[PDB]
Amino acid sequence: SYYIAPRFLDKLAVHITKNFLNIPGVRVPLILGIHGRKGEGKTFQCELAFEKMGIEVTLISGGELESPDAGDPARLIRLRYRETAELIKVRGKMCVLMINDLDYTVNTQLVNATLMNIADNPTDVQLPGSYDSNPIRRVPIIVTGNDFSTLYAPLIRDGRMEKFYWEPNRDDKVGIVGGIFAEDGLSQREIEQLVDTFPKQSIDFFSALRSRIYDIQIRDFIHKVGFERISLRVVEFKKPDFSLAHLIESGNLVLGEQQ
Amino acid sequence: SYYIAPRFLDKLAVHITKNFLNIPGVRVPLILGIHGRKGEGKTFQCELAFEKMGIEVTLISGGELESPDAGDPARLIRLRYRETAELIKVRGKMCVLMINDLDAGAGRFDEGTQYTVNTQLVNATLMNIADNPTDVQLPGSYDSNPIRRVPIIVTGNDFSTLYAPLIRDGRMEKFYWEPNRDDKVGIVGGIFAEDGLSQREIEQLVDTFPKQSIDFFSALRSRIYDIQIRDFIHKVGFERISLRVVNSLEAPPEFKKPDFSLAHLIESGNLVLG
Amino acid sequence: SYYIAPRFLDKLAVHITKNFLNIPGVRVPLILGIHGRKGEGKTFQCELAFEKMGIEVTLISGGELESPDAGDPARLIRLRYRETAELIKVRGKMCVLMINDLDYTVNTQLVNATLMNIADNPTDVQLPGSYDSNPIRRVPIIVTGNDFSTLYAPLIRDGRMEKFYWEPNRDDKVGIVGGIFAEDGLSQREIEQLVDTFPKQSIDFFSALRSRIYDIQIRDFIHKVGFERISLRVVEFKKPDFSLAHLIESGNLVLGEQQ
Amino acid sequence: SYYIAPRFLDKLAVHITKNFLNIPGVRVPLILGIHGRKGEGKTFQCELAFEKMGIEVTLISGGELESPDAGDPARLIRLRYRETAELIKVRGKMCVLMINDLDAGAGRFDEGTQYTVNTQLVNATLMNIADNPTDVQLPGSYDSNPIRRVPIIVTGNDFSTLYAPLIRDGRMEKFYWEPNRDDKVGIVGGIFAEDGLSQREIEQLVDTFPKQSIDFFSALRSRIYDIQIRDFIHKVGFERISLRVVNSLEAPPEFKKPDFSLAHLIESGNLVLG
Amino acid sequence: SYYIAPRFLDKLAVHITKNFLNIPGVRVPLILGIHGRKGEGKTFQCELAFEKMGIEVTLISGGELESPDAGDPARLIRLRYRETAELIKVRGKMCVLMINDLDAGAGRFDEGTQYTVNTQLVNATLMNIADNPTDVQLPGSYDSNPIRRVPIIVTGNDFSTLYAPLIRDGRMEKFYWEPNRDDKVGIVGGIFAEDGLSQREIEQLVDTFPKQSIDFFSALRSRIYDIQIRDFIHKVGFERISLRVVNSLEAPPEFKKPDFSLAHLIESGNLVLG
Amino acid sequence: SYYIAPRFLDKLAVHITKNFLNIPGVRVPLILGIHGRKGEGKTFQCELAFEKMGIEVTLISGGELESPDAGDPARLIRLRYRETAELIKVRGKMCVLMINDLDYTVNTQLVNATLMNIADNPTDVQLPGSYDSNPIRRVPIIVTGNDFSTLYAPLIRDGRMEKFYWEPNRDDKVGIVGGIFAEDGLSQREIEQLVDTFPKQSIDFFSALRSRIYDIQIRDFIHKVGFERISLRVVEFKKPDFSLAHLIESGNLVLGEQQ
Numbered sequence A, C, F: 001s002y003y004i005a006p007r008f009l010d011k012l013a014v015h016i017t018k019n020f021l022n023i024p025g026v027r028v029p030l031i032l033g034i035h036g037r038k039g040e041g042k043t044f045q046c047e048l049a050f051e052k053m054g055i056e057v058t059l060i061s062g063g064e065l066e067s068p069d070a071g072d073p074a075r076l077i078r079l080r081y082r083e084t085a086e087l088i089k090v091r092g093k094m095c096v097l098m099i100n101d102l103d104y105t106v107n108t109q110l111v112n113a114t115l116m117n118i119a120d121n122p123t124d125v126q127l128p129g130s131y132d133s134n135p136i137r138r139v140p141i142i143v144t145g146n147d148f149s150t151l152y153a154p155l156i157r158d159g160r161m162e163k164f165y166w167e168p169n170r171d172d173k174v175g176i177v178g179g180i181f182a183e184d185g186l187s188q189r190e191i192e193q194l195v196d197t198f199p200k201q202s203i204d205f206f207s208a209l210r211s212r213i214y215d216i217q218i219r220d221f222i223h224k225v226g227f228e229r230i231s232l233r234v235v236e237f238k239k240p241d242f243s244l245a246h247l248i249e250s251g252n253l254v255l256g257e258q259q
Numbered sequence B, D, E: 001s002y003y004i005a006p007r008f009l010d011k012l013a014v015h016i017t018k019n020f021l022n023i024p025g026v027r028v029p030l031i032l033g034i035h036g037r038k039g040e041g042k043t044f045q046c047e048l049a050f051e052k053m054g055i056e057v058t059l060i061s062g063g064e065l066e067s068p069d070a071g072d073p074a075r076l077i078r079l080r081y082r083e084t085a086e087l088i089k090v091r092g093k094m095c096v097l098m099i100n101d102l103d104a105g106a107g108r109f110d111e112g113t114q115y116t117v118n119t120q121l122v123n124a125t126l127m128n129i130a131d132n133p134t135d136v137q138l139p140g141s142y143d144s145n146p147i148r149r150v151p152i153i154v155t156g157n158d159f160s161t162l163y164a165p166l167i168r169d170g171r172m173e174k175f176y177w178e179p180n181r182d183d184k185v186g187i188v189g190g191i192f193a194e195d196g197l198s199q200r201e202i203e204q205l206v207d208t209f210p211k212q213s214i215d216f217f218s219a220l221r222s223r224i225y226d227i228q229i230r231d232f233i234h235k236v237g238f239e240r241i242s243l244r245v246v247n248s249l250e251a252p253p254e255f256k257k258p259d260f261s262l263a264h265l266i267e268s269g270n271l272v273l274g
């Protein structure tokens, strides 16, 4: 069972809900910009939160915009925005547009430009070349990335975008790591020790570490049979060690040879 | 609450009124071009001024003129000019044509797409209307009767050098909107008019963030309900928050206005900028 | 009655006339580049001079070139040049091409490039892609702008462009301001005092000041009736103050809240 | 001679073997994306690994996917996936689909031409295959039987941000290849394994050029035959050298392996870099 | 007045004469490419040289080759080559084909338009003519008789790297024209030959503006008539100046040559540069 | 009879031959980059070497690539490469692709990019948009230029390109200059003196000097007849001086007025 950090869940839930309330005399930022080191569960925890709140999400990947092969990223964002706006009026539920891994320089400008224009009038979002007298719904936008260009400063400053820095703290790690290894028969104190052993590491390192433990088996199994005859043999059965000792050496081999 | 900057109201009231008078000895510009930065309450101050003088507004949005689906923008501007003309005659009141965001996807708002406002055709159209505000006809039409002069308000971030001939001839007047300290104290004071702040604290707040737009200050007042909102979410529970806010069955949540200080606003402000 | 500054009228008249004389052993600059602070009557005084000399002018606006919406500025200049060249042969009169407010960086280069090429051979000016064995007439070109790019240095240097700096002096102001207020029943000494009161200001400030005096009336008239009922009232009759006292306070309100 | 870096061999052997096992409790990524710089023996270490495990490889080259003449690249990748599937079934051995140079003409290898790998369609295809590796059909075909899961190896210099969803879902695993000091000592040692060099001299050679790719080191060993070659040209004579080397009548020239020292390699290296 | 720089005249006279001689032991280049900066009297020194040797010139302008309306430029160059050939035969005198401004809208003279000189087709054509100057036929024509070799002079600011093969084969010779101090003293001296200046003052004038083109110096002499001109305008009156200068009824105004000094020229020069 | 410098002939011959040998365990650079001051016989000596070894050469000029008028330089290189690859399989002889005068910035990148890609796989060189399962032959590429962009550093470094600096030394000059004047009845000691008199000069200066001697005649002949009547006269017969004294003054006039 995966673990969503309470203050992460709050920030995101408050942002979305605040966009669907129409408290007069209170302008609301349309965009939530979640930034921080890569692989700290920005995307994963958003998805946890949405599943929990029963929110349907329209998802664009950052690579879908940074690439020359995708043509027009302004169009794509505006298409998905208007699409999510209709799903609100239809399903009568909270819906969200999400852009992932927003961290090229040329498409980056167009993307910033597009989000600025949408945030300026979340209700009058037209496809380029098109015009529709119809107001459409305001759709809260969640964005993730390593940091946000100084080109986003004007948005944050005028309260059209809310920045949120995500750096898991140790209670947050114990919870998330605890969930990563929740099916591996571990006690909290083993979980607390694991986190304290690798304390500058990203959440990603820890889920990588879990997969590595399975890889180490398969490696040894291959060394035993020999490479010469591994193919015939297969064309690795047991529950691996997972003891806290083994997770640590496995982690140290990862950190001694990483990236 | 909302504060109308006297000089914004004067400029716009004088421009419109002057267009309904036939004072000799001076040329009256038909067009008032209001330019300046975003988040300073331009279109909004216009709205407060119109709502106040009881002025009825025909609108053209910049995303309208940016579109083929508005057809010929020359034809559209003329249409709405004529449509707007019939109402001074019919309703017997001051009416205004207003064109908003006359430079939609330009500069830092450029999305790098095939479509942009044909601004030269727009300029050309306004020039033609302005030379003879009393005979504005659709292209290809010739035998219609004279009509009433309609003052035109255009907003944008800046106006192209193309508008220079209009200005040079006194057919258009640029009005730059950058709120000054006195303006900000007024507007910001109105934003925090129910929060039990002294005049001096409002002056302090403005002086603490001398480079910020008006929108920075109202954005600032907005983030403090967040706690009530979060708590409201916890009470209803995450499993059922969606149903609660969007299905309009039971009543909207009733939020109290919170208490805060100058100190807290300044702190919040620095966090936003840091 | 508007006032043209004698040395402005001379410079321009000498340039044009010099281009229509064919004094052998004397090469003549084709381009007159008039530069200076904005709103000092560069354009207005050119127009005064042309009206006076009975010169027909072909006018291009700088914004007509700086804009992406106008396509090809080289073409446009060359079209208008050849057009003015024909009007000489037809009307048998002095004709002039004028480019206004030349102060983007990309079109600016093409414009400079176009004027260089034309100035190099004022008689062989072909539309791009076209060729015509026919010589056409030499057409003097007047250009205005705040300053001229270092890209114009080669032209000025080889005597294909004459630079002329325009900064009205006080005799020039008294004359021009005197004409701006010529119908407002003012004595020279009131005109001389007005100019001396606002002495770093552009001519533009002064014609703005005159219009402001009318605006102040209409303002007060609106304050009296009230905004609530101004619309019905109209759907401001008298000759405004214009006393030298009133022009001064009006000017000081303009300079205390300008741009 | 050739040295297989243990950890390269382990990563690739584990990835492939893991794809032929049905171990529960963990998701097995179908795709192994091997990225890193050029001239570090990537595709080559893969070849040594495949030749070793007796693994048969179906290939797609990046210049294949860059071409209309490969038709639809989605259709091609699927074809070769299915073609590669039939062989695990038929030959009863481990088989791999491998896509090489997945970013052919991008970055410093850009030739500025109309054609580039439609990498989004490629990504989309791999995503679809990966969700269901057991039912991979050509577009427009529906009623074929299940097939065998095929591990996929892709090489490139870097992988687009588009592959992030594949990785995030554990359908793909990135493996960065930058040879470390221990790797280089191994590989370089194998390059100079017949040249009578001590372990220490090999360590010295590596440490003298710590920033160089593997290809720099073998390039270095190659230029020393040049003298034998020149002399061979002088003997045959320039008039007849062409006939001699290309017409395969008489036998290929037989060159001796020369003697050289660490000192000479280092000198040669500095000349190449200077 | 006009001064012909001896070495310009020698280079061009030798190039042309050499092309009408059949001296063995050396290859004669058909083409003389004269390059260098604008405003240095290139085309003009050519004109003085041709007028002097009694050489008749067939011309192609760069704006001709830039145009579809010249049709195929390969066909045109060949036409004029043949046209120019018939005259050495008919008139019995030296004749030259001259191509001017061979790089019309390139570099700082680029107008950013669809049309530019197809310079590769031009180069290709000159290459072909040069290999066989005696059989130059229009494309698609085959059975014409031999003709006379025509020396070709081309001017431009620089010559593309494409002309390298022509030069390498001695079919073309580049001649760079940058006036040196001795040249300038000559040319400038000729510009001011009627102004009662000593040799030393001319040397001083040249040395005061060592970086300026020849055109800077004649531009300088030109602006001093301005006063006579202004006064002439005042006499006739602004109302009637247009009629006077352009209608060729009464006679052209007769201007006197004014008196001026080195001091005044230098001052004027600094004002122009400042 | 023209003279090829022995070490120039060696370097080039060794490079080409080395590309046609398939000595296992020896990777061979495909590209030979010959760089140095302009006009030192880089191109000319390549051509001498090819004529000597009976090598047919496919030649591209650098200007054929640097120009906007030639469209696609990647294509052009790849076309010529595949063409030379076929001539090997057909003629059964050594063939070479040569690129001359490679010393705009935009095409320069594409050219570098193209040579990198070809050098990476000399056997799988496809036209853009095309694919052919067929291996084609490895074609050694010779390139000349004044220097090679830092963009070529990766190639040289990974042994896909061999750099070769060409600066003629005095034995090299005596040989080459000796051949330039081989038909002018000169002794070596006159040749040695000529080279020592103009010792910082390029080989180009010397072949220019030879042509100048003929030009000086024709000049004097023109001065005698007079320019006024040179045309009629012609519409310069003798073997010119060529004495070592005359070559020297002719050289000094060239160096006193050059470029």
Ligand SMILES: Nc1ncnc2c1ncn2[C@@H]1O[C@H](COP(=O)(O)OP(=O)(O)O)[C@@H](O)[C@H]1O
Residues within 6 Å of the ligand: A002, A003, A004, A037, A038, A039, A040, A041, A042, A043, A044, A045, A048, A144, A176, A179, A180, A203, A204, A207, D167, D168, D169
């Ligand atoms: N709350 C979580 N529970 C379990 N695993 C997680 C959690 N957050 C992150 N992970 C693991 O770490 C990886 C990286 O998370 P991701 O959302 O991609 O980080 P970011 O969005 O900050 O780059 C995921 O692929 C997942 O396996």
Ligand SMILES: Nc1ncnc2c1ncn2[C@@H]1O[C@H](COP(=O)(O)OP(=O)(O)O)[C@@H](O)[C@H]1O
Residues within 6 Å of the ligand: B167, B168, B169, C002, C003, C004, C037, C038, C039, C040, C041, C042, C043, C044, C045, C048, C144, C176, C179, C180, C203, C204, C207
């Ligand atoms: N000679 C003049 N007489 C009367 N008004 C003038 C005169 N010159 C300028 N003005 C006023 O000042 C304004 C600015 O002049 P303009 O020619 O636009 O200046 P510039 O060309 O230097 O920018 C004009 O719109 C006009 O109202």
Ligand SMILES: Nc1ncnc2c1ncn2[C@@H]1O[C@H](COP(=O)(O)OP(=O)(O)O)[C@@H](O)[C@H]1O
Residues within 6 Å of the ligand: E167, E168, E169, F002, F003, F004, F037, F038, F039, F040, F041, F042, F043, F044, F045, F048, F144, F176, F179, F180, F203, F204, F207
């Ligand atoms: N080996 C040689 N023999 C005779 N002449 C030569 C020789 N090398 C160069 N030249 C002369 O010098 C000129 C310049 O040589 P080139 O090959 O163009 O130099 P680079 O290729 O270095 O620019 C040639 O046009 C030729 O006349």
Ligand SMILES: [Cl-]
Residues within 6 Å of the ligand: B208, B209, B210, B211, B212
């Ligand atoms: Cl601030």
Ligand SMILES: [Cl-]
Residues within 6 Å of the ligand: D208, D209, D210, D211, D212
């Ligand atoms: Cl190194």
Ligand SMILES: [Cl-]
Residues within 6 Å of the ligand: E208, E209, E210, E211, E212
């Ligand atoms: Cl100078």
Ligand SMILES: [Gd]
Residues within 6 Å of the ligand: A038, A039, A040, A204
């Ligand atoms: Gd990540």
Ligand SMILES: [Gd]
Residues within 6 Å of the ligand: B082, B083
């Ligand atoms: Gd109508």
Ligand SMILES: [Gd]
Residues within 6 Å of the ligand: B203
């Ligand atoms: Gd105060």
Ligand SMILES: [Gd]
Residues within 6 Å of the ligand: B210, B211, B212, B213
């Ligand atoms: Gd401000």
Ligand SMILES: [Gd]
Residues within 6 Å of the ligand: C038, C039, C040, C204
């Ligand atoms: Gd102005």
Ligand SMILES: [Gd]
Residues within 6 Å of the ligand: D082, D083
């Ligand atoms: Gd199949």
Ligand SMILES: [Gd]
Residues within 6 Å of the ligand: D203
């Ligand atoms: Gd060691």
Ligand SMILES: [Gd]
Residues within 6 Å of the ligand: D210, D211, D212, D213
């Ligand atoms: Gd390295």
Ligand SMILES: [Gd]
Residues within 6 Å of the ligand: E082, E083
């Ligand atoms: Gd003919």
Ligand SMILES: [Gd]
Residues within 6 Å of the ligand: E203
């Ligand atoms: Gd002297």
